[PDB]
Amino acid sequence: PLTASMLASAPPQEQKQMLGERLFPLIQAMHPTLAGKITGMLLEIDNSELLHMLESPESLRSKVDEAVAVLQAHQAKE
């Protein structure tokens, strides 16, 4: 498992990579093609919050939905 202590022992860039690699397959189950963009969006969040999202599907889904809304708005402006 990825515990708070395990995460905390890693350098900052590695922490983001570790969180990303764990988040990606969970997000990919919900969004087979958009998972990479959504994961990249979520990775700017606090590491502690990202850890919680790994344990709570509801918390992850909520943030994933927010990310999709943001992406749709961004694509409209770009």
Binding site: G20, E21, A35, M41
Partner: peptide, 16 residues
């Protein structure tokens, strides 16, 4: 371009 896409096993583009 934004967002910095995550690709498994590739160092994340978003890292500065």
């Amino acid at each position: 371009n934004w967002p910095p896409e995550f690709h498994p096993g590739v160092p994340w583009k978003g890292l500065q």
